[PDB]
Design a protein around this ligand. Structure first.
Ligand SMILES: Nc1ncnc2c1ncn2[C@@H]1O[C@H](CSCC[C@H](N)C(=O)O)[C@@H](O)[C@H]1O
Ligand SMILES: [Cl-]
Length: 234
């Protein structure tokens, strides 16, 4: 019933079942990541001068992807900003629970917000790709050996000149084990910028336009969190 017990159990069933463990955890109510709401740094970015500018330039058919969305607080938030938004999660249980949690959303009603059981690695990316993608407790949910695929998928998911926001948490140093895996901005950078081979300035696929300590974090997130905004180039 404690967080640690639940984490221990979560990691145990991931060891036995692999990625199938996530729907199992959702069915059994072992969801220690679940916070019931978006993280404050997301709202404060959108409400900042850079965030206002990003939202104001959005095209009329701009699309948002929130992968590993869980109960979907972030997808609901982006939909409320006027974006046609898809919350994608591997667990059909999670997706139903998201549909319940946001049952009264006006954007769920209109179809502007949609929740779908999808594998982030496998689903067919729309032709137009995504204008804006938001990753929170998804990169850190993945085994380390899946970080490179995630970077590659992000590269094809975000249209040129589109934006990926990564709320990088938890930044816990050398702590081993996960999920949540201890991550840092460098690990996200390496995944997103791929293989150098030339060992040069990695800004080939993305420009890291903003990398900040959020001014308001959840109490438990203070000192373990950076918000980073990436723009797709080439
Ligand atoms: N390949 C994959 N594709 C889509 N979702 C995945 C996935 N692997 C794991 N997930 C989902 O990633 C989520 C990690 S838990 C955190 C969920 C959400 N970001 C929140 O902040 O509450 C789980 O819901 C899990 O079902
Ligand atoms: Cl919320």
């Amino acid at each position: 019933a404690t967080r640690d017990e639940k984490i221990t159990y979560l990691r145990k069933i991931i060891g036995d079942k692999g990625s199938d463990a996530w729907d199992v955890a959702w069915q059994e109510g072992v969801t220690p990541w679940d916070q019931g709401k978006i993280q404050p740094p997301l709202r404060d970015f959108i409400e900042s001068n850079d965030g206002k500018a990003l939202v104001n330039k959005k095209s009329d058919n701009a699309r948002v992807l929130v992968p590993g969305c869980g109960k979907g607080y972030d997808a609901a938030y982006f939909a409320s900003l006027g974006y046609e938004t898809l919350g994608a999660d591997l667990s059909s249980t999670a997706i139903e629970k998201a549909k319940e949690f946001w049952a009264e959303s006006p954007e769920l009603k209109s179809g502007k917000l949609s929740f779908q059981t999808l594998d982030f690695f496998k689903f067919e990316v729309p032709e137009a790709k995504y204008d804006l993608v938001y990753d929170y407790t998804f990169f850190c949910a993945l085994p380390p050996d899946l970080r490179a695929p995630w970077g590659a998928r992000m590269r094809e998911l975000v249209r040129p000149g589109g934006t990926l926001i990564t709320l990088v948490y938890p930044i816990d140093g050398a702590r081993s084990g996960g999920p949540p895996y201890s991550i840092d901005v460098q690990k996200v950078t390496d995944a997103l910028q791929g293989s150098e081979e030339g060992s040069a300035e990695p800004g080939k696929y993305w420009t890291k336009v903003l990398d900040i300590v959020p001014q308001t974090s959840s109490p438990d997130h203070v000192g373990r969190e950076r918000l980073v905004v990436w723009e797709r180039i080439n």
